[PDB]
Amino acid sequence: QKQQSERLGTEAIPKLLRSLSIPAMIGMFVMALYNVVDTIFISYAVGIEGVAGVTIAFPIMMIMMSMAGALGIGGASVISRRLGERRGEEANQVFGNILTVILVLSVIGFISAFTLLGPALQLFGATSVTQGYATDYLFPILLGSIFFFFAFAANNIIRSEGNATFAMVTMIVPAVLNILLDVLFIFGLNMGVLGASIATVIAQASVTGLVLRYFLTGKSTLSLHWSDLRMKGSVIKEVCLVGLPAFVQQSSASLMMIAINSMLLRFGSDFYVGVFGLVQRIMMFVMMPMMGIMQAMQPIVGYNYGAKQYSRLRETVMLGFKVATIFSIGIFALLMLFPEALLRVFTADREVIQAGVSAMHILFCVTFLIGAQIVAGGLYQSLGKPKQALILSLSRQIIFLIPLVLILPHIFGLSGVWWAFPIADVLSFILTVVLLYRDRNVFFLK
Numbered sequence: 164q165k166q167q168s169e170r171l172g173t174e175a176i177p178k179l180l181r182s183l184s185i186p187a188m189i190g191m192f193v194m195a196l197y198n199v200v201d202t203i204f205i206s207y208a209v210g211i212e213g214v215a216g217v218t219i220a221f222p223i224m225m226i227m228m229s230m231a232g233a234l235g236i237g238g239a240s241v242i243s244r245r246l247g248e249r250r251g252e253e254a255n256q257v258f259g260n261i262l263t264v265i266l267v268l269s270v271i272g273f274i275s276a277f278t279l280l281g282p283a284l285q286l287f288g289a290t291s292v293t294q295g296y297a298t299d300y301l302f303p304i305l306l307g308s309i310f311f312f313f314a315f316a317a318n319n320i321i322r323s324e325g326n327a328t329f330a331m332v333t334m335i336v337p338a339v340l341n342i343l344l345d346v347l348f349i350f351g352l353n354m355g356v357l358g359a360s361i362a363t364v365i366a367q368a369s370v371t372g373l374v375l376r377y378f379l380t381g382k383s384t385l386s387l388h389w390s391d392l393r394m395k396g397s398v399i400k401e402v403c404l405v406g407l408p409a410f411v412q413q414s415s416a417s418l419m420m421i422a423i424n425s426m427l428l429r430f431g432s433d434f435y436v437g438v439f440g441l442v443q444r445i446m447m448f449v450m451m452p453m454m455g456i457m458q459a460m461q462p463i464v465g466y467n468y469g470a471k472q473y474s475r476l477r478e479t480v481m482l483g484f485k486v487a488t489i490f491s492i493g494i495f496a497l498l499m500l501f502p503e504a505l506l507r508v509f510t511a512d513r514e515v516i517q518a519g520v521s522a523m524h525i526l527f528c529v530t531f532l533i534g535a536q537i538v539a540g541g542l543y544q545s546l547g548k549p550k551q552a553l554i555l556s557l558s559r560q561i562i563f564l565i566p567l568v569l570i571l572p573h574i575f576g577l578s579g580v581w582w583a584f585p586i587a588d589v590l591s592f593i594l595t596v597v598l599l600y601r602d603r604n605v606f607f608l609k
């Protein structure tokens with residue numbers, strides 16, 4: 164029991180979404196610029212050698228942040244199921260008792276910096292040029308580690324409460340920084356990769372600072388305590404609980420895209436990695452829409468399961484779905500009428516826009532069914548019974564995917580790239596359908 168600050172606890176709920184969503188929308192989008200507007204730099208004061216350094220370097224940042232991420236979500240979906248179901252103090256407790264396993268690992272990374280770095284780095288596509296670039300990319304971030312975790316944690320918890328607004332600003336602001344901060348090193352000085360890393364730490368420093376305020380200084384939205392508050396909850400079990408399927412979902416993609424990246428180092432030493440790199444943030448970029456809408460329910464379908472207005476959550480979960488679908492068909496078409504002009508960033512051969520958009524064609528007559536397929540994820544995860552979300556993640560990500568690529572690549576062709584996907588996802592979607600008529604209780608309304 165606590166003081167629900169201006170937790171928008173007030174059930175104003177389909178503008179709860181409206182208002183809740185867009186902030187996501189916003190900062191999500193923003194930082195995505197920083198990528199873009201960062202990397203276009205690394206493609207300058209360095210070439211395409213480092214652009215890949217970066218990209219081989221990438222999955223190892225993901226391996227840390229994944230861990231934090233569970234941690235973050237773990238908290239999110241605890242802390243939501245514990246307001247509404249109004250244990251407002253259990254909350255307080257949790258927040259910090261995460262901060263713990265955080266500050267534990269914020270060291271594990273700092274250690275592994277001075278340790279496991281090169282070891283794993285060299286461990287696959289080690290082009291003696293890019294080898295250093297990834298190294299000089301990766302060393303700082305780990306020094307490093309700390310600011311990094313806190314802030315995705317905080318930004319997850321601050322959603323998990325309600326401050327999508329100050330979220331925005333956990334985003335908007337390393338963002339703007341890390342531009343001018345890059346410019347400052349990268350091109351401004353000459354500390355290239357080596358230094359656009361140190362930029363993107365001095366980013367995560369000067370947030371961390373600010374997050375403390377929205378948890379210490381006029382500690383806003385809610386229960387937020389600092390002296391002995393936390394130690395080592397038996398709730399650590401309770402968050403990992405939740406996070407369990409969360410940090411699979413990364414380690415899944417992540418630990419499978421080390422593969423497809425270093426396997427793209429044996430053929431295309433570099434030419435091709437910064438076209439992995441490239442074709443990603445147009446997946447993610449126009450994933451946002453979806454993602455953002457998701458993160459609106461994150462905590463909405465949080466304080467209404469609790470013990471609260473069940474009646475008013477099926478409302479969410481319907482709308483949840485309802486909207487995502489229209490942006491499902493959306494992305495989809497705009498991902499199949501404009502797959503030309505976005506292959507005009509890819510302007511090369513008249514066979515580049517041939518099979519180069521052959522894949523980019525019916526590879527994605529799946530998109531439109533991805534809307535649900537991904538909403539169903541929050542509403543097993545805000546609702547801290549991620550045991551079916553577990554079940555669910557492993558379906559999409561591995562157990563149907565790889566076994567489908569592998570069962571096409573065992574001689575079936577670069578069609579083994581195609582079918583392997585469009586048809587994988589459908590099964591995940593059909594599965595997901597079943598996981599909801601599984602619970603005539605998320606949606607116990609239509």
Ligand SMILES: COc1ccc(CCN(C)CCC[C@@](C#N)(c2ccc(OC)c(OC)c2)C(C)C)cc1OC
Pocket residue numbers: 194195196197198199201224225228232315413
């Ligand atoms: C925007 O440009 C960049 C910014 C930061 C980084 C560093 C990568 N770090 C591991 C940051 C965490 C990855 C991050 C992304 N994208 C991310 C976190 C969790 C996710 O799970 C839904 C996620 O989706 C795969 C992405 C966010 C939180 C920054 C790379 C960037 O591009 C190479």
